[PDB]
Symmetry: none
Subunit: 113 residues, 4 copies
C-alpha cells in the first residue's frame, strides 16, 4: 500500500538513472571536475547564481550589467565542450522528467480542481 | 526502455491514488467544492499563499500585515470544519508527496544547484 | 550634478536615520538583542524564512508553523513592539522611495 | 533639512544627470520603433522569467542560456537597443549608490 508507493518510486528512480541521458550528465559532471578550466567556469557560474536573486528585487528596468554578465558566461559555456555537454544533456533529461512529472502527479492535479 | 519508465510512472500514480491519505484529502476537497463559503476562504487562502511566496525572492520576513492576515486565515480554518478537515488531512498526504519529489524529481534539479 | 546627487543623498540618509520612527525600530531591535527569550524567537523566525522559499495546493504544515510564530510574536511584547514599529517605518520609507525614483518610473 | 525636501531635491538631481537624460532619450527612441519595442517588451518578460527561476537555487539551464544568447545577439544587432543598454549601465551606478547610501542603513 505504502510499500507500493516506495517500490514504484524506487524503480522509477532506477529506470531514470539507467537512461543514457542520466549516464551522460553524470559523466559530464565528473569531466568538468577533472578539468581545471571547465571547473573554474562552473564554480563561477554557480557563484553568479546569487546575482540572479539580486535581480529580483532590483529589476523593474532592464539590467544591462546583468545582461552582459550572463551573456558572457553563456559564451564561455558554449565554447567549452565539457560545459556545453553537461548543460545539453541536463536539458534533455529535464525534458523527459517533465513528462514523467505529469503522469506521477496527475492525481494531485485532480485535487487542485 | 523509456517504455518501462512510463510503466513505472503510471504505477506510481496508481499507488498514490491507493493511499488512504490520498483518499481522505480527495473526500475533504470535494466537501469544500460542495460548500460555496469554504470555497471562497480556500480560494482566498491560495491567493494569500502566493502572496507569501512572492516574499520568497525578496528574503524579507512577513510583516505585521501578513502576520495579521495569517491570524485571520487561521481562525477561519479552525472554525470551519470542512477547512480544518482538509488542512489536517493534506498534512498527512504531504509527507508522501515530498518523499516522491525527493526520490524521483529533486535529483535532476540538483544537477543545477 | 553628481555632487548635488551625493549631497542630497547624504541629507536624506541622515534625515531618515533621524526620524523618530527609525529610532523606535532600532531601539526595539536592540531590546530583542538584549532579551535572551525574544532573541531566540526572532532567530527562529529568521530561520523560517528559508521555509517560505521551499514554498516553491495549500501547505497545511506551512500555515500551522507560520500561524505559530505569529502567536509567539503577539505573545512577546518586545517582538510585537518591533513589528508594529517596523511597519510604521516601512510606510515612510515607501513614500520616500516613490519620490526619489519617480524619474525611473517614467522610464517604464 | 527634512526628508520630503531632500527626497525631492534628490529626484530633481537625478533628472539633471546627463546619464539620466541619455537614458530617457534612448527609451523614447525605442518607444517609437515597433522593431525595438517588441524586443524590449520581450527582454523584460525574460528578465521576469530569470527573476522567478532565480529563487530555486538553480543555474539557468541550456534553454535559458540560449534565450539570453538570442537576446544578446538582438541587442548587439539593434542600434536603439545597443544605445539603451550602454546608457543604462552608466545610470545604474547612480541608482545603485542612492539605494546604498539612502535606504539600506534603514531596512
Amino acid at each position: 500500500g505504502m510499500s507500493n508507493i516506495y517500490d514504484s518510486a524506487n524503480e522509477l528512480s532506477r529506470g531514470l538513472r539507467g537512461l543514457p541521458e542520466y549516464k551522460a550528465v553524470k559523466a559530464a559532471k565528473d569531466a568538468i571536475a577533472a578539468d581545471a578550466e571547465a571547473s573554474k567556469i562552473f564554480t563561477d557560474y554557480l557563484a553568479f547564481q546569487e546575482e540572479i536573486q539580486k535581480l529580483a528585487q532590483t529589476g523593474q528596468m532592464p539590467d544591462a550589467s546583468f545582461q552582459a554578465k550572463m551573456e558572457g558566461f553563456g559564451k564561455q559555456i558554449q565554447g567549452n565542450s565539457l560545459l556545453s555537454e553537461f548543460f545539453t544533456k541536463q536539458q534533455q533529461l529535464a525534458i523527459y522528467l517533465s513528462d514523467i512529472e505529469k503522469i506521477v502527479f496527475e492525481p494531485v492535479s485532480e485535487l487542485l480542481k
